[PDB]
Design an enzyme around this catalytic site. Structure first.
Site, short mmCIF file in Angstrom:
data_model
loop_
_atom_site.label_atom_id
_atom_site.label_comp_id
_atom_site.label_asym_id
_atom_site.label_seq_id
_atom_site.Cartn_x
_atom_site.Cartn_y
_atom_site.Cartn_z
N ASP A 202 1.24 -1.01 0.46
CA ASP A 202 -0.13 -0.11 0.05
C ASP A 202 1.12 1.57 -0.53
OD1 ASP A 202 -1.86 2.30 0.52
OD2 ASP A 202 -2.87 1.14 1.81
N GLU A 204 -0.66 3.69 -0.96
CA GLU A 204 -1.73 5.32 -1.09
C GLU A 204 -2.15 5.41 -2.57
OE1 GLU A 204 -3.16 7.29 2.10
OE2 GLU A 204 -4.08 6.63 0.04
N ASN A 205 -3.27 5.44 -2.53
CA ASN A 205 -4.04 5.53 -3.65
C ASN A 205 -3.90 4.57 -4.73
OD1 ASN A 205 -5.85 7.76 -2.45
ND2 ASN A 205 -4.09 9.38 -3.91
N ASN A 206 -3.98 3.33 -3.80
CA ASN A 206 -3.14 2.09 -4.97
C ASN A 206 -2.37 1.59 -3.87
OD1 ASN A 206 -2.05 3.92 -8.25
ND2 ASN A 206 -3.19 2.02 -7.76
N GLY A 279 -4.52 3.66 5.39
CA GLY A 279 -3.99 5.33 6.04
C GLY A 279 -4.81 6.12 6.52
N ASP A 280 -6.19 6.18 5.77
CA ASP A 280 -7.23 7.17 6.06
C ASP A 280 -8.00 7.03 7.38
OD1 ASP A 280 -8.73 5.59 4.34
OD2 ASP A 280 -8.63 6.35 2.77
N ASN A 401 -25.40 -7.42 10.88
CA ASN A 401 -25.38 -6.51 11.00
C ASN A 401 -25.47 -6.58 12.35
OD1 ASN A 401 -25.34 -3.83 9.55
ND2 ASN A 401 -27.62 -4.77 8.68
N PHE A 402 -25.19 -7.22 12.65
CA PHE A 402 -25.46 -8.38 14.18
C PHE A 402 -26.45 -8.50 14.72
CE2 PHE A 402 -21.70 -4.70 13.49
CZ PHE A 402 -20.71 -5.65 14.26
N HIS A 446 -29.22 -13.52 23.91
CA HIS A 446 -30.19 -12.90 23.55
C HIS A 446 -30.57 -11.40 24.29
CE1 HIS A 446 -31.65 -14.16 27.59
NE2 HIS A 446 -30.00 -15.27 27.25
N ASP A 471 -26.70 -14.34 29.57
CA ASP A 471 -27.40 -14.00 28.77
C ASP A 471 -26.60 -14.38 27.31
OD1 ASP A 471 -29.68 -12.44 29.55
OD2 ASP A 471 -28.94 -11.15 28.80
O1 LIG Z 1 -23.28 -8.90 11.46
C1 LIG Z 1 -21.93 -8.26 10.57
C2 LIG Z 1 -22.09 -7.89 9.42
O2 LIG Z 1 -23.99 -7.49 8.98
C3 LIG Z 1 -23.60 -7.61 7.67
O3 LIG Z 1 -23.51 -6.62 6.50
C4 LIG Z 1 -22.58 -9.23 7.38
O4 LIG Z 1 -23.78 -9.43 6.69
C5 LIG Z 1 -21.94 -9.12 8.65
O5 LIG Z 1 -20.76 -10.05 8.13
O1 LIG Z 2 -33.71 -11.43 26.18
C1 LIG Z 2 -34.10 -11.39 27.58
C2 LIG Z 2 -34.11 -10.26 29.09
O2 LIG Z 2 -33.64 -8.68 28.38
C3 LIG Z 2 -32.89 -7.97 28.62
O3 LIG Z 2 -33.43 -7.33 29.47
C4 LIG Z 2 -31.89 -9.16 28.77
O4 LIG Z 2 -30.94 -8.27 28.18
C5 LIG Z 2 -31.75 -10.29 29.07
O5 LIG Z 2 -31.71 -11.21 29.65
O1 LIG Z 3 -4.09 2.85 -1.34
C1 LIG Z 3 -5.09 2.21 -0.98
C2 LIG Z 3 -5.76 2.92 0.46
O2 LIG Z 3 -6.65 4.24 -0.21
C3 LIG Z 3 -6.33 5.23 0.93
O3 LIG Z 3 -7.85 5.32 0.89
C4 LIG Z 3 -6.38 4.61 2.08
O4 LIG Z 3 -6.13 5.18 3.07
C5 LIG Z 3 -5.52 3.48 1.12
O5 LIG Z 3 -4.58 2.52 2.56
#
Ligand SMILES: OC[C@@H]1O[C@@H](O)[C@H](O)[C@H]1O
Ligand SMILES: OC[C@@H]1O[C@@H](O)[C@H](O)[C@H]1O
Ligand SMILES: OC[C@@H]1O[C@@H](O)[C@H](O)[C@H]1O
Ligand SMILES: *[C@@H]1O[C@H](CO)[C@@H](O[C@@H]2O[C@H](CO)[C@@H](O)[C@H](O)[C@H]2NC(C)=O)[C@H](O)[C@H]1NC(C)=O
Length: 482
Positions: A202, A204-206, A279-280, A401-402, A446, A471
């Site tokens: 890397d 930068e920009n590449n 880098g950015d 998205n977790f 949960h 949980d």
């Molecule tokens: O759950 C976190 C991320 O969210 C989604 O963008 C991807 O599938 C996953 O890896």
């Molecule tokens: O999932 C049920 C309950 O909801 C939240 O209050 C707690 O994280 C969990 O124990």
């Molecule tokens: O050069 C590749 C990436 O491009 C830029 O956006 C980042 O700073 C660098 O890591």
């Protein structure tokens, strides 16, 4: 002799040396890295078992028992004080508080070096370390060398899994303002032969895989479980050398003049050090870092060969990602909630929403199957597992998205990684805790009766530390669907 002893002997000393697995100097006995646990947010350091030895993994296991751990600092062993800490926001914001990048889990990359247990730095998208006021690192067009032992199977195509020289402002200040190792299969800039990943530089920009911008047939795909990536740059010259960190020699993928484009000769290096990000502060990449250094001066091939021999001698071997109860492929199970006041609920689902529901013998056949899961070999890692719905075969629990969702396996790497979970002895001591393989700081959790891939504390409401341990602990029982 350790890698830095070898580089020193070659007249191109380490100016920064980082590793959570071992000392890189035969005489180093100081702190390798720092830990912080979610239980009480206290910290502790991990040092080699003996001068120039392997990290004291047991000390970490002890400190992180019945809780979660994050690697807060990766100390610079050279003495220059170029420690790596939580990467700050820059051109791009990280996903953590105030734009910082996430810290890496302390247990996402277990390994053994010549039989001794150790931990690497498993970095999921959004994770990053940096030091914007480093000493001794090359600036301007000054020569430097660097290498890193990474995981050739853990990577992606987003910018940018780097380790090396970068801007001190965390912004893209132009071509020539960077010089770092890159490992992944991004094709936005440069790329090599095959499907990747490729070791690139890397600047930068590449991302360069060779002399030309873009495609360069001379840079092969390298996907060894442990990869030694060695890069160096000097006055109108640079090189890429790669190898199986577990065996053999380094092969030169590129050696020659700077890419013939404005801004790359002379270079304008700034001396900052980055890890796992661009880098950015581009933070969409993933990868695993075990050890690596940066030097002053252009290392000769001979010096690097000796370093490679030392790494091979270290005998890196993959460690166990699983602990506690665990399962067998083909086994059908039901997972019961152990959080007081919800002990009669089980992990189930309503359409694509994975949640917890009260399930018992009077439940319908449909609900019993919705609360029954066929455990199969981990889709992205054979050590771990994936959970397939009994009522909806072909679909698995995956985080998006977790949030945990039940989606059909589309055969893609992304789905595979989102659907792989590693069993860990329950944090509350009751049953198992399913840790996400791709995001080791997150567990099946949960929250208000809905399942998420949550961390012990975090920017999402469901990452609440309240009742976390309970949980994320589930009892493995016979499946309702028999
Ligand atoms: O759950 C976190 C991320 O969210 C989604 O963008 C991807 O599938 C996953 O890896
Ligand atoms: O999932 C049920 C309950 O909801 C939240 O209050 C707690 O994280 C969990 O124990
Ligand atoms: O050069 C590749 C990436 O491009 C830029 O956006 C980042 O700073 C660098 O890591
Ligand atoms: C980097 O490698 C992965 C894995 O080979 C590529 O991912 C595939 O992604 C495409 C684009 O979404 C899908 O059609 C395929 O089904 C995926 N294959 C697998 C095996 O997951 C990814 O596209 C590559 N990246 C680049 C930039 O080329």
């Amino acid at each position: 002799m350790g890698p830095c002893d070898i580089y020193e002997a070659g007249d191109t000393p380490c100016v920064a040396a980082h590793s959570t697995t071992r000392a890189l100097y035969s005489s180093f006995s100081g702190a390798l890295y720092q830990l912080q646990r979610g239980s009480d947010d206290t910290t502790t350091t991990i040092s080699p078992l003996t001068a120039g030895g392997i990290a004291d993994a047991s000390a970490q296991d002890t400190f992180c028992a019945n809780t979660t751990c994050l690697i807060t600092i990766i100390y610079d062993q050279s003495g220059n004080g170029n420690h790596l800490t939580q990467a700050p926001p820059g051109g791009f914001d990280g996903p953590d508080t105030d734009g910082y990048d996430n810290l890496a889990s302390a247990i996402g990359a277990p390994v053994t070096l010549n039989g001794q247990k150790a931990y690497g730095v498993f970095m999921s998208p959004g994770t990053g370390y940096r030091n914007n006021e480093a000493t001794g690192t090359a600036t301007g067009d000054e020569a430097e060398g660097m290498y890193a032992v990474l995981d050739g199977t853990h990577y992606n195509d987003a910018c940018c899994f780097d380790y090396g020289n970068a801007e001190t402002s965390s912004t893209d200040t132009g071509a020539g303002h960077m010089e770092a190792i890159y490992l992944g299969n991004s094709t936005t800039w440069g790329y090599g032969a095959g499907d990747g990943p490729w070791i690139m530089v890397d600047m930068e920009n590449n991302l360069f895989s060779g002399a030309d911008e873009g495609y360069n047939s001379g840079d092969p795909s390298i996907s060894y479980r442990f990869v030694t990536a060695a890069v160096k740059g000097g006055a109108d010259k640079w090189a890429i050398r790669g190898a199986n960190a577990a065996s053999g020699s380094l092969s030169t993928y590129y050696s020659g003049a700077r890419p013939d484009y404005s801004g790359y000769n002379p270079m304008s290096k700034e001396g900052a050090i980055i890890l796992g990000i661009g880098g950015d502060n581009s933070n969409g990449a993933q990868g695993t870092f075990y050890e690596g250094v940066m030097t002053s001066g252009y290392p000769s091939d001979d010096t690097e060969n000796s370093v490679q021999e030392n790494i091979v001698a270290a005998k890196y071997v993959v460690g166990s990602l699983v602990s506690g109860p665990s399962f067998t492929s083909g086994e059908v199970v039901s997972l019961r909630v152990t959080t007081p006041g919800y002990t009669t609920r089980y992990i189930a689902h309503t359409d694509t929403t994975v949640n917890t529901q009260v399930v018992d013998d009077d439940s319908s056949t449909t609900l019993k199957e919705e609360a029954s899961w066929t455990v199969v070999t981990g889709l992205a890692n054979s050590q771990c597992f994936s959970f397939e719905s009994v009522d909806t075969p072909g679909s698995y629990i995956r985080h998006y998205n977790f949030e945990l969702l039940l989606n059909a396996n589309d055969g893609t790497k992304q789905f595979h990684e989102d659907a792989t979970f590693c069993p860990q002895a329950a944090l509350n001591g009751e049953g198992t805790s399913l840790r996400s393989w791709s995001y080791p700081t997150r567990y099946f959790r949960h929250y208000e009766n809905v399942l998420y891939a949550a961390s012990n504390g975090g920017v999402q409401t469901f990452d609440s530390k309240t009742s976390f341990n309970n949980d994320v602990s589930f009892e493995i029982e016979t499946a309702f669907a028999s």
